[PDB]
Scaffold this active site. Structure first.
Site, PDB file in Angstrom:
ATOM      1  N   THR A   1      13.979   6.340   0.106  1.00  0.00           N
ATOM      2  CA  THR A   1      14.542   4.936   0.157  1.00  0.00           C
ATOM      3  C   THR A   1      13.369   3.848  -0.160  1.00  0.00           C
ATOM      4  OG1 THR A   1      15.642   5.744   1.998  1.00  0.00           O
ATOM      5  CG2 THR A   1      15.137   3.468   1.936  1.00  0.00           C
TER       6      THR A   1
HETATM    7  C1  LIG Z   1      15.370  10.174   7.310  1.00  0.00           C
HETATM    8  O1  LIG Z   1      15.043   9.611   6.066  1.00  0.00           O
HETATM    9  C2  LIG Z   1      16.049  10.261   4.961  1.00  0.00           C
HETATM   10  C3  LIG Z   1      17.305   9.680   5.408  1.00  0.00           C
HETATM   11  N1  LIG Z   1      18.470  10.975   5.538  1.00  0.00           N
HETATM   12  C4  LIG Z   1      19.086  10.746   6.648  1.00  0.00           C
HETATM   13  O2  LIG Z   1      18.856   9.943   7.568  1.00  0.00           O
HETATM   14  C5  LIG Z   1      19.996  11.880   6.917  1.00  0.00           C
HETATM   15  C6  LIG Z   1      21.386  11.414   6.240  1.00  0.00           C
HETATM   16  C7  LIG Z   1      22.482  12.288   5.769  1.00  0.00           C
HETATM   17  O3  LIG Z   1      21.983  13.355   5.255  1.00  0.00           O
HETATM   18  N2  LIG Z   1      23.583  12.060   5.805  1.00  0.00           N
HETATM   19  C8  LIG Z   1      24.868  12.904   5.539  1.00  0.00           C
HETATM   20  C9  LIG Z   1      26.111  12.238   5.954  1.00  0.00           C
HETATM   21  C10 LIG Z   1      25.735  11.134   6.969  1.00  0.00           C
HETATM   22  C11 LIG Z   1      24.403  10.676   6.450  1.00  0.00           C
HETATM   23  N3  LIG Z   1      20.411  12.510   8.002  1.00  0.00           N
HETATM   24  C12 LIG Z   1      19.405  13.412   8.758  1.00  0.00           C
HETATM   25  O4  LIG Z   1      18.573  13.756   8.119  1.00  0.00           O
HETATM   26  C13 LIG Z   1      19.523  13.828  10.265  1.00  0.00           C
HETATM   27  C14 LIG Z   1      18.309  13.876  10.839  1.00  0.00           C
HETATM   28  C15 LIG Z   1      18.674  14.388  12.245  1.00  0.00           C
HETATM   29  C16 LIG Z   1      18.419  15.773  12.551  1.00  0.00           C
HETATM   30  C17 LIG Z   1      18.662  16.207  14.010  1.00  0.00           C
HETATM   31  C18 LIG Z   1      18.542  15.185  14.954  1.00  0.00           C
HETATM   32  C19 LIG Z   1      18.626  13.846  14.585  1.00  0.00           C
HETATM   33  C20 LIG Z   1      18.604  13.509  13.160  1.00  0.00           C
HETATM   34  C21 LIG Z   1      18.018   8.747   4.278  1.00  0.00           C
HETATM   35  O5  LIG Z   1      18.397   8.935   3.339  1.00  0.00           O
HETATM   36  N4  LIG Z   1      17.506   7.472   4.560  1.00  0.00           N
HETATM   37  C22 LIG Z   1      18.170   6.266   3.566  1.00  0.00           C
HETATM   38  C23 LIG Z   1      19.287   5.328   4.501  1.00  0.00           C
HETATM   39  C24 LIG Z   1      18.819   4.185   4.633  1.00  0.00           C
HETATM   40  C25 LIG Z   1      19.793   3.023   5.281  1.00  0.00           C
HETATM   41  C26 LIG Z   1      21.063   3.442   5.252  1.00  0.00           C
HETATM   42  C27 LIG Z   1      21.659   4.830   4.635  1.00  0.00           C
HETATM   43  C28 LIG Z   1      22.997   5.262   4.924  1.00  0.00           C
HETATM   44  C29 LIG Z   1      23.377   6.146   4.487  1.00  0.00           C
HETATM   45  C30 LIG Z   1      22.493   7.339   3.818  1.00  0.00           C
HETATM   46  C31 LIG Z   1      20.987   6.902   4.138  1.00  0.00           C
HETATM   47  C32 LIG Z   1      20.702   5.739   4.204  1.00  0.00           C
END
Ligand SMILES: COC[C@H](NC(=O)[C@H](CC(=O)n1cccc1)NC(=O)CCc1ccccc1)C(=O)NCc1cccc2ccccc12
Ligand SMILES: COC[C@H](NC(=O)[C@H](CC(=O)n1cccc1)NC(=O)CCc1ccccc1)C(=O)NCc1cccc2ccccc12
Ligand SMILES: COC[C@H](NC(=O)[C@H](CC(=O)n1cccc1)NC(=O)CCc1ccccc1)C(=O)NCc1cccc2ccccc12
Ligand SMILES: COC[C@H](NC(=O)[C@H](CC(=O)n1cccc1)NC(=O)CCc1ccccc1)C(=O)NCc1cccc2ccccc12
Lengths: 220, 223, 222, 218, 222, 216, 222, 217
Positions: free
Chosen positions: E1
């Protein structure tokens, strides 16, 4: 509710008219308290805080509750901030709020009337302050003296012709006992409770005048 | 820190050092650890400064509160009990580093013999108390040096003046063997504070008198 | 971070650096760490920025809240006690990493002698306070360098202007030995902030004056 | 219900009409408060927030309760958001809601009548606002002046004839003491005066007492 | 990001990448991390997606809510304060791994100068905030690359068009050094999203302008 | 009971009759709110949600409490589910519920009368909805217009005769002020739910623009 | 576990395997993981069986509850948001091992384009959600094998029958590389379960149809 | 105290008498609900659970509260146990208990009269059940029809003479509107059925063109 308020007001009024009188007057040395009190240990005049004293007329348990609550308020405030932040006007104000509440919401109003007096801190130049809080919470500050309990108008008239600013302790006490005597319906040491807020005491200004000292001051 | 208190004929004296520390660094030189808590009692406290001053302040308020509410001051035993209850109240936080141990010195006006109306009470962290029938006591990191000094100097106490001197001298021996206790600072004119209590009440001893006794002791050891 | 405060005849001065860090990385060059909290009082805070700004804001609110409720401001002693209660209140969070220590500088209008009415109060993490009788004090990761500097420069303080100068030179020594305190940036024109408080109240020191004094010190060290 | 609410409004109205009167008027420099008050230390006029002031008639303890709650509300809102989000309209509205509840649900209605005043922020150009909140929570917008307490109609009529917009401080003070005389002879010792002065940089409330007040009455 | 935001004369621009990851795995290519939260405000958030979106939605309703209750929108300072309080509210959850840091970009209708009306606010995990005087800011795992890029490119920002180019190029450098930040996908035609805000409000920058800027950079680097 | 409630109903009916009048009309562009309101800063007409507006007659502090309560309900519902699930019918339903409780259980009933109006979402084709809610919680769905506050019979009669569906903004405005007199900028508060705006339909028409639409 | 969902012209298909495990032990083979939650929505869940079944049941109850109380069903956004809130609600228990990850497939009746009314939403453990633009999605221990199988096979989906076939084939590749995902059991005649949704609603696919597509796949790879 | 109780009873009876009328009758396909209702969006007839429907007469906000409370009870029990543990009897019983409590203890009694109806689960041969709950919590088991609100006697009189078991949907609807007349059209009616032939949710509104087609022709 005009019924209820009238009847409560009259219950309080008649309650105080039936009670002995208390006089508080400013003199050159601070503030003087004189009250008609036969008892040896039950006290209508009290210390609240360093430069703040309390006097009450009416039903003993009620104005004693207010005295204790006033001490609680002063001590808590002085701890939360500083002793010098505790003021006469604050205690007079809390009593006005408290008695307003009691008068409107308790089963029976308090048949009490209060005086809070404050003198200046040691080494300062500040006129004494006297506050009179009535049974419904009305509050008024008076510059020279306050009378409470029993038939007030004879006593207040006696003072308003008798009172002189910057009197001596002996002079202010003598005029005070004269004005109290005008309203009684038989006085002396055994029959009086006397105390002063002494603007010359270094920290705690409240001090009592009893027995031999009181007699020496009444003979003038 | 070291606070000492000792009885002399017709009264009691309490004195405390002026040093404030955080580890090895001196964070204060003029700090006051000995307080007039009521017209006939003085309190000195050792430990964490925040908690120590909080205790002294609240304790003085508690006593005066009782006195205005009830028209009479507390008995001396009642005062001991209130300090004890306050300390034990703090035992949980004290276990975590917020420690404050008090020492109490007073004159009991309701005592039988006004000759021996002086009182010295020491406490422990659980609020245990001791009313001392041997004349002196101390608290703080230098208390063992001070008590061992007074053990040898206490025989010279005959009046308020010799007793005050001996108190400052034990505080001197404490500061000499304990780096957390500050000795007399002859450059800044900072000396221990002391309170004297007799039948006329409790008064803080004038700083000049401590400077005179301090330099007196310093020369007493230079020759 | 370094914050200094020092007494001069008839007043007091307080100054603070402008640097914000996250570890070794510079996260800010113009942050403000000294605040006018009251007509006769200023506060400087060191530690976590979030907690420090909340402290100064919330403290100013408590002072003026009291003043409007009771028609008179708190005595200086009352102000100190309330700041101490706030710190001690934060002690748990500080133990978990949200630590913020304040330094209080004021002018007591109810003091007897108007020239020695200046006041400096320092605190510790449990809310211990000390009213400083020795003329100057500091707080922050450079506080030792600044205190040692002022120890040598304080004798030159005769009025508000010389006092403000030794303050800025103390922040200069602090920044010179401590990377968490930022010195004067002559390329961006960013200099410490300072407040003066005297009998006429608390006023913010103009940046141009501090710029002058900075260049005097830099010149004097070349 | 009908009879009882009638009784509450009659009790409150009578309590206020027995009370000394207070006047607030907009002038060239902001808002002027003048109250008939012998007391040396008890206040009918007070600061609420930076540009917001409070004046009241009736039972002291009651409008004092409302004053403290107003200060409480304003300081909390300014902290939760920002000082510039506190407005006179907001405080007047909270007073309306408060007196509505008090009037309908407390043991005794409050014998009070309230005025919230707001001047512009420093350097900004906004005309003062006056609000009247009465004992039952009714709220009213006033551009020029407010009268509260005692015998109101003589005071309101004297002001209806003598009032001019953007008058100076001295002239507005003269008008105010005149209208106050018409109702419930008035010097410093018997008057309490204060202004919301739009030229102060932040806190606009300011008291005019003693030497300054007498200097303005001559 | 990577989320970037920069001031230009008379406006502000905010732009963000489209990549969603779970460790090394790409879980999304088209996500939106920059949201118009208000008629003069946009928020971009980095960190855990669930919390980042929850922050965006709840913040936007909080602003409209105040506006409908009190008939007037919050001052810009109030908006800063409410967002900060939201971050600090989440700190306990953040220390367990649900961390999200926002970047706030707005236009202050109550500013005196129509060209100093742009606002860029950055935050830390405790809710500490900074109103950025120096023209640009970024957040996310690529923020350091993006900020150093903007450090060299910001001098050429004179209007919204050039500002938007510098933004897309800063995101391009971030994606060039950070595998968690996604660059322009020319096979799928996915490009960073941008919000532009001026005196007329906040509007979404259409895809086509961002794509042509992207191909302009991709051309210039060949 | 039966007597006590008759007295409450009368206190409400009399209190609301003493207040100023408010009118709401469906027109070609959405819904128009016209109220007699001298105040510069106290408003009888307010936005509730994207496509839902609120108008009231009676005691100010009381219908302002209902207004703030409605905004609170609408916003939490949109957050809990989705913005598009917030509808006029449901806000009218909570108002009927709430005023029912107030009317039976509060120290004093609310001397108020409410109109909740909803226009279609942008690009969709739906006849506006008007709801009246009275002091006792009675709710009525009205197809063309609502009158509230004061002496309603003259105003409702004036509209009943003079009302035209699919009127222009100037057309509906002039019929509305005409009926209200059975009145310049300073005396009027006007706003619309404008079905042509993309999300928030509520638009206040103040001062110069309002004056422009009245004079013709 | 593997659950697949994919878009076809005018509808969506969702299918899931039948295997239930405790570590390496097979504790169930006829398990259902795909449920009709309302007339136009199906949910498949992976993870702890107790929590997966609790989610599906409670979610269906929640939607019908709203529908009867308010006379109209929730918009699709509302359905996504309630499922997301539910997952985030279960996050604490998921940390201690009671994890349940949903995949949502639906047909939006209030959508603008009738043959783009298909919807596929995947979630993360925090209740993060993603509306998938790219035609297919999967969840469970075999989701990556299935998603890679569909990445090559999705160009063949031209109607409900081909979409259903690709769905069953992705479940075949999933079980082919993942022991926690059950393949077709030809001795017992147990096959994946599937739900299809178009404008006429959501219906369960008959067992025999899935059986013959499975036999088609098995035959075709031998 | 009995003065308070007769006063409440008369307040409720008067309020219900001034309101519009509703009839529910059992027919060959299940149960039919038809109510006089001018509104286009406010509803007096509702689904409670899979095979259970709800009808009410009286003050809207009050029976709307009761309708939601019934929906809450049904969904909660169905989740806590199983769907097929939710029955009409049970919902009728909880309404009796709730309305008794209201009638004795709330600030004002509820001006409502309630009907809970249940048809058989799909493929079962149980005869429909009708329950009447009155403002004081009185509960009555009815086999053929329920009339509520306004002047009941004439409509019930028309039904007693005109009601036949196992009528067709068109026939039962025509008997229903005919009985209602004694005391009109699409714009003035709200109709719905508990249809014992639908596999899960038996409740079904009949609106507009379908309704009009089914009234006379
Ligand atoms: C933590 O930094 C990496 C982060 N990834 C995640 O958060 C991913 C997102 C993902 O894979 N998705 C798939 C369908 C729904 C979302 N989520 C996770 O990794 C879940 C983490 C978790 C595990 C166990 C308990 C609590 C939390 C990311 O990509 N963050 C970037 C980001 C910023 C703003 C808005 C966003 C909206 C959608 C997707 C990404 C977005
Ligand atoms: C015994 O141990 C050392 C102790 N020092 C401290 O407590 C010092 C005092 C200090 O440096 N101050 C700075 C100005 C104001 C206080 N304070 C501390 O050490 C802070 C303790 C702490 C650590 C981590 C988390 C929370 C709290 C001390 O000197 N105590 C001596 C002492 C006794 C009675 C009254 C006193 C009053 C003031 C100052 C000291 C006093
Ligand atoms: C000494 O420690 C370093 C401290 N730095 C921080 O606190 C920096 C400041 C920062 O980077 N910001 C970015 C934009 C907004 C602030 N923040 C942090 O270090 C984050 C703290 C944290 C991390 C993880 C969990 C919980 C809390 C600092 O600079 N302190 C100095 C300081 C004092 C008074 C007011 C200030 C205002 C702003 C910035 C700094 C200020
Ligand atoms: C992937 O993870 C393995 C998971 N297995 C389990 O959860 C199995 C299911 C099982 O063996 N059952 C036996 C009869 C009752 C169920 N249960 C467990 O593994 C116990 C979890 C646990 C351990 C310690 C403390 C608390 C809880 C699984 O197979 N999940 C697959 C699955 C997905 C959706 C719906 C399902 C419905 C029924 C069965 C399975 C289902």
């Amino acid at each position: 509710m005009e019924q209820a308020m009238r009847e409560r007001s009259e219950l309080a009024r008649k309650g105080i008219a039936r009670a002995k009188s208390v006089v508080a007057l400013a003199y050159a040395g601070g503030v003087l308290f004189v009250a008609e009190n036969p008892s040896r240990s039950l006290q209508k005049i009290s210390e609240l805080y360093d430069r703040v004293g309390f006097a009450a007329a009416g039903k003993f348990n009620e104005f004693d509750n207010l005295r204790r609550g006033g001490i609680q308020f002063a001590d808590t405030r002085g701890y939360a901030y500083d002793r010098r932040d505790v003021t006469g006007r604050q205690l007079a104000n809390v009593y006005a709020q408290t008695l307003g509440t009691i008068f409107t919401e308790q089963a029976k109003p308090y048949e009490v009337e209060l005086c809070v007096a404050e003198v200046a801190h040691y080494g300062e130049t500040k006129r004494p302050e006297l506050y009179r809080i009535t049974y419904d919470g009305s509050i008024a500050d008076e510059p020279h003296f306050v009378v409470m309990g029993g038939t007030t108008e004879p006593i207040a008239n006696a003072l308003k012709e008798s009172y002189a600013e910057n009197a001596s302790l002996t002079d202010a006490l003598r005029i005070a006992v004269a004005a109290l005597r005008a309203g009684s319906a038989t006085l002396g040491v055994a029959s009086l409770e006397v105390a002063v807020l002494d603007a010359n005491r270094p920290r705690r200004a409240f001090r009592r005048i009893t027995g031999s000292a009181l007699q020496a001051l009444l003979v003038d | 820190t070291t606070i000492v208190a000792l009885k002399y004929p017709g009264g009691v004296v309490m004195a405390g050092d002026r040093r404030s520390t955080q580890g090895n660094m001196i964070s204060g030189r003029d700090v006051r650890k000995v307080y007039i808590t009521d017209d006939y009692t003085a309190t000195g406290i050792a430990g964490t400064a925040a908690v120590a001053v909080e205790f002294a302040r609240l304790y003085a308020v508690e006593l005066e509160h009782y006195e205005k509410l009830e028209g009479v001051p507390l008995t001396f035993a009642g005062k001991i009990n209130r300090l004890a209850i306050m300390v034990r109240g703090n035992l949980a936080a004290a276990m975590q580093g917020l420690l404050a141990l008090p020492l109490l010195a007073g004159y009991d006006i309701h005592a039988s013999d006004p000759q021996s109306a002086g009182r010295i009470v020491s406490f422990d962290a659980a609020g245990g108390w001791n009313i001392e029938e041997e004349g002196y006591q101390a608290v703080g990191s230098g208390s063992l040096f001070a008590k061992s000094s007074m053990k040898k100097l206490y025989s010279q106490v005959t009046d308020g003046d010799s007793g005050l001197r001996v108190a400052v001298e034990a505080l001197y021996d404490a500061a000499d063997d304990d780096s957390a206790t500050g000795g007399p600072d002859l450059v800044r004119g900072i000396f221990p504070t002391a309170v004297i209590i007799d039948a006329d009440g409790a008064v803080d001893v004038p700083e000049s008198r401590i400077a005179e006794l301090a330099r007196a002791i310093i020369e007493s050891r230079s020759g």
